[PDB]
């Protein structure tokens, strides 16, 4: 009896760790579409904490830890020092790069969009830093024809502000990347914490 | 209508972070309870984090992460290195005694009981590591006349495995604590988000 009840409370214990990944993964969407940086930070702290007490994953559960991530990193593009991999040599951008490739979803033409905008940022922050033989190593590590060429002249020619990536900008990318996010939000919306918790505001109205 | 929207979606994620608050106190004091240190070590850091995205809290809330504060203080009492308070000269059984005396509870023989304990064992651990004059010190913080010159006399003969340090050992405090968390699982095991995880593992047996 005692081992019984042992085990049906770790198993509620999961189904409620399973609903607070799927609320926290909504509220971490709206902070990062909102450029609410603060409650990004604290949402994703407590992401992170949440999903070391989870073991069994289902494929959502995956794909939806995959969305928290790739929007960490892409949140931390342009912060350098920061070690998302075992390799040191893998920057944020190449690191969301790899989840991007990673996730269970559609490749409709805003996937290979957001994709091609990570690339070209990828090295585009390496050389707004000054980072010139970076920016090299990202581009062999990524690229793995006129695409291709155009941005290793770029490199070599040490045009950190290049109108090339004025036209494919960082905001861009943001934007393009905050198109994606509303799908998700509207996705997750009706999961179970979110409902219930929407049911209790509004019934006090 | 912008405004409106992000209003109730904010007031939506204070209720669920309330309901995530009370959860992770019933887990901590589930694993605190069972000795399971890994699964405590964990729980802890999911509930500072989800402390951390709280604002406004009422008197329940603040009693539940009391409790929560003071199991964390209570499971490193012999770890003299950790410093829970701005004053680093506190120790970890002082904090878990001045939590003790702020949480807004019945003042019981049970409760008196474990005040007691958390005193005799604030200075026994300070004995143990062979840190007299902290133990010295840890004394006239807490004392703050029958008990009070038996330890005062205890500390000045240096005798670290005193016989009345067996008596009120550091297991019969931790014993004392778990029957009072036993009391606080009763209490917690009817909050939302158990109950729906429960239901929901009930209806698949
Ligand atoms: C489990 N990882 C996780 C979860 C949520 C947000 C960010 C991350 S991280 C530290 O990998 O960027
Ligand atoms: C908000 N503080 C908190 C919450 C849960 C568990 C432990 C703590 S602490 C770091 O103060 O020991
Ligand atoms: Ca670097
Ligand atoms: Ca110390």
């Avoid at 989840?99 to 979803?105: A, Q």
């Avoid at 010139?132 to 941005?151: D, N, Q, T, W, Y």
Wanted: proline share 1%.
């Amino acid at each position: 009896e005692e081992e019984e009840d042992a085990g049906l409370v770790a198993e509620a214990e999961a189904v409620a760790a399973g609903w607070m990944l799927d609320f926290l993964c909504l509220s971490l969407c709206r902070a990062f579409r909102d450029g609410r940086s603060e409650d990004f930070r604290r949402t994703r702290n407590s992401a992170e904490a949440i999903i070391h007490g989870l073991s069994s994953l289902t494929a959502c559960q995956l794909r939806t830890i995959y969305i928290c991530q790739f929007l960490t990193r892409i949140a931390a593009g342009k912060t350098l020092d920061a070690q998302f991999e075992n390799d040191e040599r893998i920057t944020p951008l190449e690191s969301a790069l790899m989840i991007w490739g990673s996730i269970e979803k559609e490749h409709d033409k805003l996937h290979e969009e957001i994709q091609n905008l990570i690339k070209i940022q990828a090295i585009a922050v390496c050389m707004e830093n000054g980072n010139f033989k970076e920016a090299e190593e990202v581009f062999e590590r990524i690229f793995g024809m006129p695409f291709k060429s155009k941005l290793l002249m770029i490199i070599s020619q040490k045009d950190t502000f290049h109108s090339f990536f004025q036209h494919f900008s960082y905001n861009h990318m943001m934007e393009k990347i905050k198109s994606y996010v509303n799908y998700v939000l509207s996705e997750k919306s009706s999961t179970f914490l979110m409902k219930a918790a929407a049911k209790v505001v509004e019934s006090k109205r």
